[PDB]
């Protein structure tokens, strides 16, 4: 079980660790988060009490190094850093644990929520979408734009999601205009799965990462990407049976986890109605259709 | 964005543009079967593709053979329209290619956009105008070439005959829309107004009669009266 120590908490802030969150008061003796489950990516995220604008945070995997948080009074944010000295870090964590100045990652044993939201998400894929190769962890915030959003302005701070565009030469074979537009199977299976992603696991990993950035940071471009990757599958007449069954599980846990009060901003009416009621896969998402109908019948 | 009353003069500027009307592409007669069910029989159709500045009409005849063994024909008709308009643009020399294509029905936007991906600088636009181009098949010579077609065929016309020798494009388009609006509202009465005087003929190379400037004013008046008479019938006002 891994630990992310905090040097201090000089400014009042709501701290998120995956789907959990804690309020910390200005100069509260908070020194970090212990008992973090090994084997998953994690996200540690922040919303300042004095400027709720800019949610921001760090994707990391404790198997890849020893990470800590330290407030930077110049840049005015909580920064993730790597401690390269193993013994210095173990000694910091042991002290803070002994003085019980750390919150415990509050995982209920029955609860597979985080596994289910991050099943396909791999740190190495995150680091290609979020490019800052000198760090092993990845910064994301509310305002970062996607490569696609920038096409339609600082490339170093972009989310490099795979560009999906239904009215693009990439999506439409010359001479198969109507066929490829109404049935996106060649775009899904040849261009995206075989071509770019190599396999369904990488495609699902990007879909899951886009959702989490949409939910945790209200990142609008991430929300667009999550919906585009759903729509590309639901609009394909030919999808492997294992992908449809897995998609139904993925979306079920995403809809289950979404704060009830954010359905209005994070869910696209057109995409969901099309995916559940009109699309080729209208009858292939039983779990998702049932949770959506019971939790968000207004949207539909 | 959308072509409306506000940006109407744009039709007659020097940027090449085409209107595309797909109304008459997929045409059927509905009839009873022997068993008393209902079936359709397709008849020949046409794409109505018009340069409103020059009057050049690219009438692509849609032969009933293009529907044989196809499903969802009203959907296919939009895509076949987009395919043929794309083929027409690619057949034109670069300096004759339109800068804009205005579709008379919003359902043509995606099919035409997808067929025209090779032409990113050609703007595909809808219109808020209610244009009467459905009435093209009330022009006898256009109806005749469509019905007699035994295979796919493109026929080129000038829908303004020689009018641009005497009037501006704006005025020619206004005359055309009034004639087509009348033919659409009351075909019998409109054709009666156009041929009532046997001394005024249609030249072999024309679509409409050879009216003097003064006779066009009288004709245009008779067409406006027909449209209001009919309107005071539809609505009883």
Short mmCIF file of C-alpha atoms in Angstrom, two decimals:
data_model
loop_
_atom_site.label_atom_id
_atom_site.label_comp_id
_atom_site.label_asym_id
_atom_site.label_seq_id
_atom_site.Cartn_x
_atom_site.Cartn_y
_atom_site.Cartn_z
CA UNK A 1 0.00 0.00 0.00
CA UNK A 2 1.68 3.25 -1.21
CA UNK A 3 1.75 6.79 0.20
CA UNK A 4 1.79 10.32 -1.27
CA UNK A 5 3.06 12.61 1.50
CA UNK A 6 2.35 16.38 1.54
CA UNK A 7 5.06 18.79 2.75
CA UNK A 8 2.23 21.01 4.12
CA UNK A 9 -1.24 22.48 3.34
CA UNK A 10 -0.72 26.28 3.38
CA UNK A 11 -4.01 27.11 1.54
CA UNK A 12 -7.54 25.85 2.21
CA UNK A 13 -8.39 23.29 -0.49
CA UNK A 14 -10.70 20.38 -1.33
CA UNK A 15 -8.40 17.37 -2.10
CA UNK A 16 -9.63 14.49 -4.26
CA UNK A 17 -8.01 11.06 -4.39
CA UNK A 18 -9.78 9.08 -7.16
CA UNK A 19 -13.55 9.16 -6.33
CA UNK A 20 -12.99 10.35 -2.67
CA UNK A 21 -12.58 13.95 -1.39
CA UNK A 22 -11.58 15.72 1.86
CA UNK A 23 -11.65 19.44 2.91
CA UNK A 24 -8.30 20.72 4.30
CA UNK A 25 -8.22 24.07 6.22
CA UNK A 26 -5.48 26.77 5.68
CA UNK A 27 -2.31 25.58 7.58
CA UNK A 28 -4.13 22.37 8.81
CA UNK A 29 -1.45 19.79 9.83
CA UNK A 30 -2.23 17.57 6.79
CA UNK A 31 0.73 15.46 5.56
CA UNK A 32 -0.85 13.27 2.89
CA UNK A 33 -2.64 10.09 1.84
CA UNK A 34 -1.64 6.54 2.83
CA UNK A 35 -2.90 2.98 2.03
CA UNK A 36 -3.25 3.78 -1.75
CA UNK A 37 -3.98 0.51 -3.61
CA UNK A 38 -1.13 -0.75 -5.77
CA UNK A 39 -2.10 -1.99 -9.25
CA UNK A 40 -4.17 0.97 -10.54
CA UNK A 41 -3.49 4.48 -11.82
CA UNK A 42 -4.69 7.15 -9.37
CA UNK A 43 -5.53 10.85 -9.62
CA UNK A 44 -4.92 13.39 -6.84
CA UNK A 45 -6.90 16.59 -7.49
CA UNK A 46 -7.45 20.01 -6.02
CA UNK A 47 -9.98 22.80 -5.90
CA UNK A 48 -8.89 25.87 -3.92
CA UNK A 49 -11.56 27.11 -1.42
CA UNK A 50 -10.83 30.78 -2.50
CA UNK A 51 -10.96 30.21 -6.31
CA UNK A 52 -13.11 27.14 -7.18
CA UNK A 53 -12.08 27.92 -10.81
CA UNK A 54 -9.28 25.60 -12.09
CA UNK A 55 -9.84 22.13 -10.73
CA UNK A 56 -6.37 20.56 -11.42
CA UNK A 57 -4.57 17.34 -10.53
CA UNK A 58 -2.03 14.60 -11.22
CA UNK A 59 -2.36 11.11 -12.68
CA UNK A 60 0.27 8.79 -11.20
CA UNK A 61 1.09 5.14 -10.51
CA UNK A 62 3.02 4.52 -7.23
CA UNK A 63 4.84 1.55 -8.88
CA UNK A 64 6.75 4.09 -11.07
CA UNK A 65 8.37 6.16 -8.26
CA UNK A 66 7.95 7.95 -4.91
CA UNK A 67 5.69 11.01 -5.40
CA UNK A 68 4.83 13.82 -2.97
CA UNK A 69 2.79 17.07 -3.05
CA UNK A 70 4.30 20.46 -2.11
CA UNK A 71 2.56 23.84 -2.38
CA UNK A 72 4.40 26.39 -4.58
CA UNK A 73 3.60 29.91 -3.31
CA UNK A 74 4.91 31.45 -6.58
CA UNK A 75 2.76 29.42 -9.06
CA UNK A 76 -0.03 29.18 -6.39
CA UNK A 77 -0.73 25.48 -6.68
CA UNK A 78 -0.14 22.09 -5.11
CA UNK A 79 2.58 20.43 -7.28
CA UNK A 80 3.44 16.76 -7.60
CA UNK A 81 7.15 16.01 -7.39
CA UNK A 82 9.27 12.81 -7.44
CA UNK A 83 11.66 12.06 -4.51
CA UNK A 84 14.63 10.13 -6.07
CA UNK A 85 16.21 9.43 -2.56
CA UNK A 86 14.38 6.21 -1.43
CA UNK A 87 15.55 6.34 2.24
CA UNK A 88 14.73 10.09 2.64
CA UNK A 89 11.17 9.36 1.35
CA UNK A 90 10.64 6.19 3.53
CA UNK A 91 11.80 8.30 6.54
CA UNK A 92 9.38 11.19 5.67
CA UNK A 93 6.42 8.76 5.28
CA UNK A 94 7.24 6.73 8.49
CA UNK A 95 7.41 10.03 10.61
CA UNK A 96 4.03 11.36 9.21
CA UNK A 97 2.35 7.94 9.66
CA UNK A 98 3.69 7.71 13.29
CA UNK A 99 2.23 11.20 14.02
CA UNK A 100 -1.03 10.04 12.18
CA UNK A 101 -1.08 13.23 10.08
CA UNK A 102 -2.27 11.24 6.97
CA UNK A 103 -5.74 10.30 5.68
CA UNK A 104 -6.24 6.68 4.66
CA UNK A 105 -7.42 5.89 1.08
CA UNK A 106 -10.91 4.86 2.26
CA UNK A 107 -11.51 1.75 0.11
CA UNK A 108 -14.49 -0.48 1.19
CA UNK A 109 -13.38 -4.15 0.59
CA UNK A 110 -16.61 -5.03 -1.47
CA UNK A 111 -16.15 -1.93 -3.69
CA UNK A 112 -14.65 -2.44 -7.19
CA UNK A 113 -15.67 1.10 -8.38
CA UNK A 114 -12.11 2.39 -9.01
CA UNK A 115 -10.93 -0.83 -10.73
CA UNK A 116 -14.09 -0.69 -12.88
CA UNK A 117 -13.46 2.98 -13.90
CA UNK A 118 -9.71 2.44 -14.65
CA UNK A 119 -9.70 -1.21 -15.94
CA UNK A 120 -8.00 -0.31 -19.27
CA UNK A 121 -6.26 2.95 -18.20
CA UNK A 122 -2.42 2.63 -18.24
CA UNK A 123 0.06 5.35 -17.11
CA UNK A 124 2.14 4.83 -20.30
CA UNK A 125 -0.99 5.72 -22.40
CA UNK A 126 -1.80 8.75 -20.19
CA UNK A 127 1.80 10.05 -20.74
CA UNK A 128 1.24 10.02 -24.58
CA UNK A 129 -2.06 11.93 -24.28
CA UNK A 130 -0.50 14.38 -21.70
CA UNK A 131 3.06 15.16 -22.97
CA UNK A 132 5.63 16.18 -20.26
CA UNK A 133 8.27 13.47 -20.54
CA UNK A 134 10.57 14.74 -17.68
CA UNK A 135 7.85 13.68 -15.12
CA UNK A 136 6.41 10.15 -14.54
CA UNK A 137 3.07 11.73 -13.49
CA UNK A 138 0.63 13.78 -15.63
CA UNK A 139 -0.96 17.18 -14.86
CA UNK A 140 -4.50 17.86 -16.11
CA UNK A 141 -6.85 20.78 -15.36
CA UNK A 142 -10.32 22.24 -16.14
CA UNK A 143 -9.07 24.55 -18.96
CA UNK A 144 -6.68 22.31 -21.02
CA UNK A 145 -7.87 22.05 -24.66
CA UNK A 146 -7.59 18.99 -26.92
CA UNK A 147 -5.59 18.71 -30.19
CA UNK A 148 -9.06 18.52 -31.95
CA UNK A 149 -10.38 21.68 -30.13
CA UNK A 150 -7.10 23.53 -31.15
CA UNK A 151 -7.57 22.57 -34.89
CA UNK A 152 -11.13 24.15 -34.93
CA UNK A 153 -3.66 27.18 -28.94
CA UNK A 154 -0.48 26.28 -26.84
CA UNK A 155 0.43 22.73 -28.08
CA UNK A 156 2.68 21.88 -25.01
CA UNK A 157 -0.40 22.09 -22.64
CA UNK A 158 -2.84 20.11 -24.93
CA UNK A 159 -4.70 16.82 -24.40
CA UNK A 160 -3.51 14.67 -27.37
CA UNK A 161 -6.64 12.47 -27.55
CA UNK A 162 -7.02 10.49 -30.81
CA UNK A 163 -8.88 12.78 -33.29
CA UNK A 164 -12.31 11.29 -34.24
CA UNK A 165 -14.27 13.20 -36.92
CA UNK A 166 -17.27 11.47 -38.61
CA UNK A 167 -17.09 13.91 -41.63
CA UNK A 168 -13.39 13.46 -42.42
CA UNK A 169 -11.52 11.63 -45.20
CA UNK A 170 -10.14 9.38 -42.39
CA UNK A 171 -13.74 8.28 -41.52
CA UNK A 172 -15.05 7.87 -45.13
CA UNK A 173 -13.57 5.70 -47.93
CA UNK A 174 -13.88 7.25 -51.42
CA UNK A 175 -16.79 5.41 -53.14
CA UNK A 176 -18.27 4.20 -49.78
CA UNK A 177 -19.58 7.64 -48.65
CA UNK A 178 -23.16 6.61 -47.68
CA UNK A 179 -22.10 3.16 -46.40
CA UNK A 180 -19.25 4.51 -44.18
CA UNK A 181 -21.33 7.50 -42.90
CA UNK A 182 -24.38 5.43 -41.85
CA UNK A 183 -22.32 2.37 -40.69
CA UNK A 184 -19.03 3.45 -39.05
CA UNK A 185 -17.66 -0.19 -38.79
CA UNK A 186 -14.71 0.40 -41.19
CA UNK A 187 -13.73 3.59 -39.23
CA UNK A 188 -14.02 1.72 -35.85
CA UNK A 189 -12.51 -1.67 -36.82
CA UNK A 190 -9.90 -0.86 -39.60
CA UNK A 191 -8.89 2.81 -39.02
CA UNK A 192 -9.17 3.09 -35.21
CA UNK A 193 -8.90 -0.46 -33.70
CA UNK A 194 -6.44 -2.19 -36.16
CA UNK A 195 -4.80 1.10 -37.34
CA UNK A 196 -4.31 3.54 -34.45
CA UNK A 197 -5.21 1.89 -31.10
CA UNK A 198 -3.91 -1.64 -32.13
CA UNK A 199 -6.54 -3.27 -29.79
CA UNK A 200 -9.86 -2.63 -27.90
CA UNK A 201 -8.00 -2.36 -24.54
CA UNK A 202 -6.14 0.83 -25.66
CA UNK A 203 -9.40 2.25 -27.14
CA UNK A 204 -11.26 1.59 -23.85
CA UNK A 205 -8.29 3.03 -21.84
CA UNK A 206 -8.56 6.36 -23.73
CA UNK A 207 -12.40 6.34 -23.43
CA UNK A 208 -12.11 5.74 -19.62
CA UNK A 209 -9.38 8.44 -19.21
CA UNK A 210 -11.50 10.99 -21.18
CA UNK A 211 -14.51 10.30 -18.88
CA UNK A 212 -12.45 10.65 -15.68
CA UNK A 213 -10.94 14.02 -16.87
CA UNK A 214 -14.47 15.19 -17.74
CA UNK A 215 -15.83 14.15 -14.31
CA UNK A 216 -12.92 15.19 -12.04
CA UNK A 217 -11.88 18.46 -13.79
CA UNK A 218 -15.07 19.40 -15.78
CA UNK A 219 -12.73 19.32 -18.81
CA UNK A 220 -15.12 20.05 -21.72
CA UNK A 221 -12.80 18.62 -24.43
CA UNK A 222 -12.46 15.34 -22.50
CA UNK A 223 -16.28 15.12 -22.35
CA UNK A 224 -16.42 15.60 -26.19
CA UNK A 225 -13.83 12.80 -26.61
CA UNK A 226 -15.69 10.37 -24.24
CA UNK A 227 -18.94 10.92 -26.21
CA UNK A 228 -17.21 10.59 -29.65
CA UNK A 229 -15.65 7.20 -28.70
CA UNK A 230 -19.05 5.94 -27.41
CA UNK A 231 -20.84 7.18 -30.54
CA UNK A 232 -18.23 5.58 -32.88
CA UNK A 233 -19.01 2.12 -31.33
CA UNK A 234 -22.84 2.55 -31.13
CA UNK A 235 -22.88 3.81 -34.81
CA UNK A 236 -21.00 0.65 -36.06
CA UNK A 237 -23.21 -2.30 -37.20
CA UNK A 238 -20.22 -4.72 -36.81
CA UNK A 239 -18.51 -4.71 -33.37
CA UNK A 240 -16.94 -7.76 -31.65
CA UNK A 241 -19.37 -9.26 -29.03
CA UNK A 242 -16.65 -8.94 -26.29
CA UNK A 243 -16.30 -5.19 -27.00
CA UNK A 244 -20.08 -4.57 -26.70
CA UNK A 245 -20.33 -6.56 -23.42
CA UNK A 246 -17.25 -4.72 -22.05
CA UNK A 247 -18.58 -1.28 -23.23
CA UNK A 248 -21.89 -1.93 -21.35
CA UNK A 249 -19.90 -2.57 -18.11
CA UNK A 250 -17.61 0.47 -18.66
CA UNK A 251 -20.52 2.87 -19.21
CA UNK A 252 -22.58 1.37 -16.35
CA UNK A 253 -19.83 2.20 -13.78
CA UNK A 254 -19.31 5.70 -15.35
CA UNK A 255 -23.07 6.53 -15.18
CA UNK A 256 -23.22 4.98 -11.65
CA UNK A 257 -20.30 7.17 -10.42
CA UNK A 258 -21.33 10.52 -12.07
CA UNK A 259 -22.60 13.02 -9.45
CA UNK A 260 -26.43 13.13 -9.95
CA UNK A 261 -26.27 17.00 -9.97
CA UNK A 262 -23.77 17.12 -13.00
CA UNK A 263 -25.85 15.04 -15.54
CA UNK A 264 -27.00 18.41 -17.13
CA UNK A 265 -23.38 19.46 -18.12
CA UNK A 266 -21.52 16.05 -18.49
CA UNK A 267 -24.15 14.07 -20.52
CA UNK A 268 -24.89 14.84 -24.22
CA UNK A 269 -28.67 14.24 -24.80
CA UNK A 270 -28.21 13.62 -28.57
CA UNK A 271 -25.43 11.04 -28.18
CA UNK A 272 -27.16 9.07 -25.38
CA UNK A 273 -30.63 9.03 -27.05
CA UNK A 274 -29.01 7.96 -30.35
CA UNK A 275 -26.81 5.29 -28.61
CA UNK A 276 -29.58 3.71 -26.46
CA UNK A 277 -32.65 4.09 -28.77
CA UNK A 278 -31.70 4.58 -32.55
CA UNK A 279 -28.16 3.12 -33.06
CA UNK A 280 -27.16 -0.36 -34.31
CA UNK A 281 -26.21 -1.17 -30.67
CA UNK A 282 -29.58 0.17 -29.24
CA UNK A 283 -30.26 -3.36 -27.78
CA UNK A 284 -26.61 -4.25 -26.84
CA UNK A 285 -26.20 -2.00 -23.69
CA UNK A 286 -28.75 -3.53 -21.22
CA UNK A 287 -26.97 -2.51 -17.99
CA UNK A 288 -26.25 1.04 -19.23
CA UNK A 289 -29.82 1.53 -20.59
CA UNK A 290 -31.27 0.36 -17.21
CA UNK A 291 -29.05 2.65 -15.04
CA UNK A 292 -29.61 5.64 -17.43
CA UNK A 293 -33.48 5.13 -17.47
CA UNK A 294 -33.62 4.83 -13.61
CA UNK A 295 -31.06 7.59 -12.79
CA UNK A 296 -31.51 10.19 -15.64
CA UNK A 297 -34.96 9.64 -17.31
CA UNK A 298 -35.21 13.48 -17.92
CA UNK A 299 -32.17 13.46 -20.30
CA UNK A 300 -34.02 10.75 -22.33
CA UNK B 1 -24.32 29.92 -42.79
CA UNK B 2 -27.94 29.87 -44.12
CA UNK B 3 -29.02 31.78 -47.27
CA UNK B 4 -32.11 34.01 -46.45
CA UNK B 5 -33.90 37.32 -47.38
CA UNK B 6 -31.01 39.27 -45.62
CA UNK B 7 -28.17 37.98 -47.93
CA UNK B 8 -30.26 37.60 -51.15
CA UNK B 9 -28.08 39.81 -53.44
CA UNK B 10 -25.22 37.29 -52.77
CA UNK B 11 -26.90 34.97 -55.40
CA UNK B 12 -26.00 37.44 -58.24
CA UNK B 13 -22.40 38.32 -57.32
CA UNK B 14 -19.34 36.97 -59.26
CA UNK B 15 -18.60 33.98 -56.90
CA UNK B 16 -19.79 30.84 -58.80
CA UNK B 17 -22.60 29.10 -56.88
CA UNK B 18 -25.16 26.39 -57.54
CA UNK B 19 -28.56 25.62 -56.00
CA UNK B 20 -29.26 21.86 -55.69
CA UNK B 21 -32.87 20.69 -55.38
CA UNK B 22 -33.41 16.96 -54.79
CA UNK B 23 -37.25 17.09 -54.65
CA UNK B 24 -37.76 15.34 -58.06
CA UNK B 25 -34.94 12.73 -57.71
CA UNK B 26 -37.08 9.89 -56.29
CA UNK B 27 -40.58 9.95 -57.82
CA UNK B 28 -43.27 7.25 -57.42
CA UNK B 29 -46.93 6.50 -58.23
CA UNK B 30 -48.68 4.73 -55.29
CA UNK B 31 -51.17 2.00 -56.45
CA UNK B 32 -53.22 -1.03 -55.21
CA UNK B 33 -51.86 -4.61 -55.77
CA UNK B 34 -54.12 -7.51 -56.85
CA UNK B 35 -54.24 -8.65 -53.16
CA UNK B 36 -55.38 -5.08 -52.20
CA UNK B 37 -52.03 -4.02 -50.60
CA UNK B 38 -50.26 -0.80 -51.65
CA UNK B 39 -47.08 -0.62 -53.73
CA UNK B 40 -45.05 2.10 -55.46
CA UNK B 41 -43.75 2.24 -59.02
CA UNK B 42 -40.77 4.60 -59.52
CA UNK B 43 -40.73 6.96 -62.52
CA UNK B 44 -37.72 8.83 -63.91
CA UNK B 45 -36.53 11.74 -61.75
CA UNK B 46 -33.96 14.54 -62.00
CA UNK B 47 -31.51 16.57 -59.94
CA UNK B 48 -32.13 20.31 -60.43
CA UNK B 49 -28.72 22.03 -60.19
CA UNK B 50 -28.85 25.71 -61.16
CA UNK B 51 -26.38 28.62 -61.40
CA UNK B 52 -28.74 31.51 -60.39
CA UNK B 53 -26.40 34.12 -61.95
CA UNK B 54 -26.02 32.58 -65.48
CA UNK B 55 -29.23 30.48 -65.67
CA UNK B 56 -27.14 27.36 -66.50
CA UNK B 57 -29.14 24.29 -65.44
CA UNK B 58 -27.38 20.90 -65.05
CA UNK B 59 -30.42 18.54 -65.25
CA UNK B 60 -29.13 15.09 -64.26
CA UNK B 61 -31.80 12.59 -65.23
CA UNK B 62 -32.27 9.81 -62.63
CA UNK B 63 -33.41 6.67 -64.47
CA UNK B 64 -35.61 4.18 -62.52
CA UNK B 65 -32.83 1.52 -63.02
CA UNK B 66 -30.72 3.25 -60.27
CA UNK B 67 -33.35 2.12 -57.67
CA UNK B 68 -33.41 -1.56 -58.79
CA UNK B 69 -32.85 -3.86 -55.77
CA UNK B 70 -32.04 -0.95 -53.44
CA UNK B 71 -33.66 -0.45 -49.98
CA UNK B 72 -34.62 2.82 -48.12
CA UNK B 73 -34.94 4.72 -51.45
CA UNK B 74 -35.87 8.16 -49.96
CA UNK B 75 -32.56 7.97 -47.95
CA UNK B 76 -30.55 6.62 -50.94
CA UNK B 77 -31.96 9.45 -53.15
CA UNK B 78 -30.18 12.04 -50.96
CA UNK B 79 -26.82 10.16 -51.30
CA UNK B 80 -27.26 9.55 -55.08
CA UNK B 81 -28.02 13.34 -55.41
CA UNK B 82 -24.80 14.14 -53.44
CA UNK B 83 -22.82 11.56 -55.55
CA UNK B 84 -24.00 13.12 -58.87
CA UNK B 85 -23.40 16.75 -57.73
CA UNK B 86 -19.85 15.75 -56.58
CA UNK B 87 -19.30 14.02 -59.97
CA UNK B 88 -20.55 17.22 -61.77
CA UNK B 89 -18.15 19.46 -59.76
CA UNK B 90 -15.19 17.07 -60.51
CA UNK B 91 -16.15 17.12 -64.25
CA UNK B 92 -15.91 20.98 -64.37
CA UNK B 93 -12.61 22.81 -64.98
CA UNK B 94 -11.25 24.31 -61.72
CA UNK B 95 -12.19 27.90 -62.74
CA UNK B 96 -15.85 26.76 -63.30
CA UNK B 97 -16.19 24.86 -59.97
CA UNK B 98 -18.62 26.52 -57.55
CA UNK B 99 -17.32 28.29 -54.39
CA UNK B 100 -20.70 27.47 -52.69
CA UNK B 101 -23.49 24.92 -53.17
CA UNK B 102 -26.88 25.87 -51.62
CA UNK B 103 -29.22 22.89 -50.93
CA UNK B 104 -32.93 23.65 -50.93
CA UNK B 105 -33.59 20.88 -48.26
CA UNK B 106 -31.54 20.59 -45.00
CA UNK B 107 -31.53 16.77 -45.32
CA UNK B 108 -29.03 17.19 -48.26
CA UNK B 109 -26.37 18.87 -46.04
CA UNK B 110 -24.61 15.80 -44.59
CA UNK B 111 -24.80 13.67 -47.78
CA UNK B 112 -23.34 16.53 -49.87
CA UNK B 113 -20.72 17.50 -47.22
CA UNK B 114 -19.48 13.84 -47.06
CA UNK B 115 -19.36 13.53 -50.92
CA UNK B 116 -17.49 16.88 -51.18
CA UNK B 117 -14.72 16.13 -48.57
CA UNK B 118 -12.16 16.37 -51.49
CA UNK B 119 -13.35 20.07 -51.86
CA UNK B 120 -12.91 21.62 -48.35
CA UNK B 121 -13.04 25.21 -49.82
CA UNK B 122 -16.54 24.64 -51.35
CA UNK B 123 -19.09 25.87 -48.73
CA UNK B 124 -22.25 23.71 -48.46
CA UNK B 125 -25.15 25.93 -47.24
CA UNK B 126 -28.83 25.54 -46.46
CA UNK B 127 -31.38 28.27 -47.25
CA UNK B 128 -34.35 29.69 -45.28
CA UNK B 129 -35.89 30.61 -48.70
CA UNK B 130 -38.90 28.41 -49.71
CA UNK B 131 -37.88 27.98 -53.40
CA UNK B 132 -40.39 26.46 -55.84
CA UNK B 133 -37.84 24.30 -57.77
CA UNK B 134 -40.11 21.20 -57.19
CA UNK B 135 -42.23 22.71 -60.03
CA UNK B 136 -39.33 22.20 -62.58
CA UNK B 137 -41.24 19.12 -63.85
CA UNK B 138 -44.13 21.51 -64.82
CA UNK B 139 -41.81 22.96 -67.56
CA UNK B 140 -42.94 20.79 -70.52
CA UNK B 141 -39.51 20.43 -72.21
CA UNK B 142 -37.81 19.42 -68.88
CA UNK B 143 -40.65 16.91 -68.06
CA UNK B 144 -40.37 15.50 -71.67
CA UNK B 145 -36.59 14.79 -71.55
CA UNK B 146 -36.90 13.17 -68.04
CA UNK B 147 -39.82 10.85 -68.99
CA UNK B 148 -38.28 9.78 -72.35
CA UNK B 149 -34.83 8.92 -70.81
CA UNK B 150 -33.98 5.20 -71.20
CA UNK B 151 -30.66 5.53 -69.27
CA UNK B 152 -28.87 8.03 -66.95
CA UNK B 153 -28.27 11.29 -68.89
CA UNK B 154 -27.15 14.88 -68.14
CA UNK B 155 -28.99 17.59 -70.17
CA UNK B 156 -27.80 21.25 -70.13
CA UNK B 157 -30.31 24.11 -70.36
CA UNK B 158 -30.39 27.87 -69.75
CA UNK B 159 -33.52 28.23 -67.56
CA UNK B 160 -33.60 32.01 -68.35
CA UNK B 161 -33.64 31.51 -72.21
CA UNK B 162 -32.24 34.82 -73.61
CA UNK B 163 -33.64 37.02 -70.74
CA UNK B 164 -30.17 38.13 -69.54
CA UNK B 165 -29.76 40.04 -72.90
CA UNK B 166 -32.44 42.46 -71.54
CA UNK B 167 -32.63 42.07 -67.68
CA UNK B 168 -30.25 41.48 -64.73
CA UNK B 169 -29.78 38.05 -63.05
CA UNK B 170 -31.69 39.39 -59.98
CA UNK B 171 -34.73 40.20 -62.16
CA UNK B 172 -34.36 36.90 -64.15
CA UNK B 173 -34.30 34.84 -60.89
CA UNK B 174 -37.37 36.79 -59.58
CA UNK B 175 -39.24 36.02 -62.88
CA UNK B 176 -38.21 32.32 -62.69
CA UNK B 177 -39.31 31.96 -58.99
CA UNK B 178 -42.68 33.69 -59.75
CA UNK B 179 -43.29 31.40 -62.79
CA UNK B 180 -42.37 28.29 -60.76
CA UNK B 181 -44.39 29.42 -57.69
CA UNK B 182 -47.49 29.86 -60.01
CA UNK B 183 -46.91 26.46 -61.70
CA UNK B 184 -46.61 24.88 -58.20
CA UNK B 185 -49.80 26.55 -56.80
CA UNK B 186 -52.06 25.99 -59.89
CA UNK B 187 -50.31 24.25 -62.79
CA UNK B 188 -53.37 24.25 -65.14
CA UNK B 189 -54.01 28.04 -64.72
CA UNK B 190 -50.27 28.92 -64.96
CA UNK B 191 -49.84 26.93 -68.25
CA UNK B 192 -53.13 28.55 -69.53
CA UNK B 193 -51.66 32.07 -68.80
CA UNK B 194 -48.36 31.16 -70.59
CA UNK B 195 -49.96 29.74 -73.83
CA UNK B 196 -53.37 31.63 -74.00
CA UNK B 197 -52.07 33.79 -76.97
CA UNK B 198 -51.10 31.34 -79.80
CA UNK B 199 -49.14 34.13 -81.65
CA UNK B 200 -46.42 33.95 -78.87
CA UNK B 201 -44.42 30.73 -79.32
CA UNK B 202 -41.54 28.94 -77.55
CA UNK B 203 -38.38 28.93 -79.66
CA UNK B 204 -37.01 25.38 -80.34
CA UNK B 205 -33.90 26.32 -78.19
CA UNK B 206 -36.02 27.88 -75.33
CA UNK B 207 -38.18 26.70 -72.41
CA UNK B 208 -40.56 29.71 -72.08
CA UNK B 209 -42.47 31.82 -74.66
CA UNK B 210 -40.85 34.73 -76.56
CA UNK B 211 -42.64 37.57 -74.66
CA UNK B 212 -41.78 41.23 -75.33
CA UNK B 213 -40.79 43.31 -72.25
CA UNK B 214 -44.43 44.64 -72.13
CA UNK B 215 -45.93 41.12 -72.45
CA UNK B 216 -43.67 39.88 -69.55
CA UNK B 217 -45.15 42.63 -67.28
CA UNK B 218 -48.72 41.43 -68.21
CA UNK B 219 -47.69 37.73 -67.70
CA UNK B 220 -45.96 38.49 -64.35
CA UNK B 221 -49.16 40.35 -63.20
CA UNK B 222 -51.38 37.38 -64.24
CA UNK B 223 -49.03 35.01 -62.25
CA UNK B 224 -49.18 37.20 -59.07
CA UNK B 225 -53.07 37.33 -59.35
CA UNK B 226 -53.14 33.48 -59.75
CA UNK B 227 -50.98 33.07 -56.62
CA UNK B 228 -53.21 35.47 -54.53
CA UNK B 229 -56.50 33.96 -55.94
CA UNK B 230 -55.20 30.44 -54.95
CA UNK B 231 -54.04 31.79 -51.52
CA UNK B 232 -57.60 33.21 -50.92
CA UNK B 233 -58.85 29.65 -51.61
CA UNK B 234 -56.37 27.56 -49.49
CA UNK B 235 -57.07 29.80 -46.43
CA UNK B 236 -60.50 31.29 -47.42
CA UNK B 237 -59.16 34.88 -46.80
#
